[PDB]
Structure formats: structure tokens, C-alpha cells
Design an enzyme around this catalytic site. Sequence first.
Site, PDB file in Angstrom:
ATOM      1  N   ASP A 131     -12.490  34.076  19.767  1.00 11.08           N
ATOM      2  CA  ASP A 131     -12.263  34.597  18.414  1.00 11.08           C
ATOM      3  C   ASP A 131     -11.236  35.729  18.441  1.00 11.08           C
ATOM      4  OD1 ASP A 131     -14.331  32.853  17.850  1.00 11.08           O
ATOM      5  OD2 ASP A 131     -15.657  34.391  17.057  1.00 11.08           O
ATOM      6  N   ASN A 187     -16.319  32.920  23.261  1.00  4.47           N
ATOM      7  CA  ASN A 187     -17.522  32.166  22.916  1.00  4.47           C
ATOM      8  C   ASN A 187     -18.008  31.405  24.141  1.00  4.47           C
ATOM      9  OD1 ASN A 187     -17.188  32.960  20.117  1.00  4.47           O
ATOM     10  ND2 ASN A 187     -15.603  31.377  19.955  1.00  4.47           N
ATOM     11  N   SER A 230     -14.042  28.735  23.820  1.00  3.96           N
ATOM     12  CA  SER A 230     -13.130  29.167  22.773  1.00  3.96           C
ATOM     13  C   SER A 230     -13.177  30.698  22.635  1.00  3.96           C
ATOM     14  CB  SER A 230     -13.478  28.480  21.458  1.00  3.96           C
ATOM     15  OG  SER A 230     -14.776  28.835  21.016  1.00  3.96           O
ATOM     16  N   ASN A 278     -11.401  31.551  15.224  1.00  2.00           N
ATOM     17  CA  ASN A 278     -11.780  30.811  16.425  1.00  2.00           C
ATOM     18  C   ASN A 278     -10.713  29.810  16.884  1.00  2.00           C
ATOM     19  OD1 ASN A 278     -13.181  29.436  18.434  1.00  2.00           O
ATOM     20  ND2 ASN A 278     -15.051  29.215  17.223  1.00  2.00           N
ATOM     21  N   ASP A 300     -18.649  28.300  24.527  1.00  4.36           N
ATOM     22  CA  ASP A 300     -17.983  27.008  24.659  1.00  4.36           C
ATOM     23  C   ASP A 300     -16.535  27.111  25.168  1.00  4.36           C
ATOM     24  OD1 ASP A 300     -16.797  28.029  22.283  1.00  4.36           O
ATOM     25  OD2 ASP A 300     -16.550  26.029  21.456  1.00  4.36           O
ATOM     26  N   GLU A 329     -17.087  41.946  11.935  1.00  4.00           N
ATOM     27  CA  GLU A 329     -16.471  41.005  12.865  1.00  4.00           C
ATOM     28  C   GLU A 329     -15.686  41.758  13.946  1.00  4.00           C
ATOM     29  OE1 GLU A 329     -16.850  37.803  13.304  1.00  4.00           O
ATOM     30  OE2 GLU A 329     -17.771  37.109  11.444  1.00  4.00           O
TER      31      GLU A 329
END
Length: 129
Positions: A52, A46, A50, A59, A48, A35
Amino acid sequence: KVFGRCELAAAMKRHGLDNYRGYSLGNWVCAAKFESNFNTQATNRNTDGSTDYGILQINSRWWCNDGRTPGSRNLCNIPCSALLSSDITASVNCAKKIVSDGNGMNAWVAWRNRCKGTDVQAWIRGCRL
Ligand SMILES: [Cl-]
Ligand code: NA
């Protein structure tokens, strides 16, 4: 902070992630590897809108507030910047809530794609725990 492999394992173990909901320590270390590459300061946007955050790439859509993800929840009730600290307490605590929500560690795409069904114990091998 960029953790060492065994350093992180020991920090996670101390915060109660070993066998947390059936997930052995090796699972969490593998998840953190792919990750964030063990970097607490890792961020990723991301599509959309958002983002992380941190060692487990939590998220902003659901789990933390970064003030730029409209119509999102703050289910762990923290600013997303708290997930970037060199102290992993907030990330671990929030992770515990995520892993308990029904879908287990399948919440982490890298775990599902790179750790699930592998020899995860190799990740804590040789570490003094
Ligand atoms: Cl599960
Ligand atoms: Na949010």
C-alpha cells in the site's frame, strides 16, 4: 510530505474530492489520517506480497505498478512511486477511480473501521476552505 489537517483538506477540496460520489470532505481527511497519518511517503507491505502506497495507501494488487506484485493489475496506470509525491494529484485521481468501482470508500479498511458512521465533519472543522 506530512500535511497539516486543514492544509490537506484544502488540497483535497481543490482536487475535487468534496462530495465526490456523495462523500463529504471530512470522509477523505479522516481516511487519510488513519491510513497514512497524513504522510505522503507512507508504505505498508501486505501479507499477499502487495504493498500500500501513499497518503491513501493505494494497493499494488489492483491499482498501481511497483514491479514486485506478480499477477497484479495497474488499473490507475501509474507507477506506485507516483503515489508518494508531495503533490497529491495522482493519489486523488486514482482514489476517484477506486471510489467509483461499486464499493465506495469501503475500499479503505481504516475508513470503514474508524470513520464510517462517525462525525466526519470534525476533521474539516475550523479550516479555512
Ligand atoms: Cl457509495
Ligand atoms: Na499492480
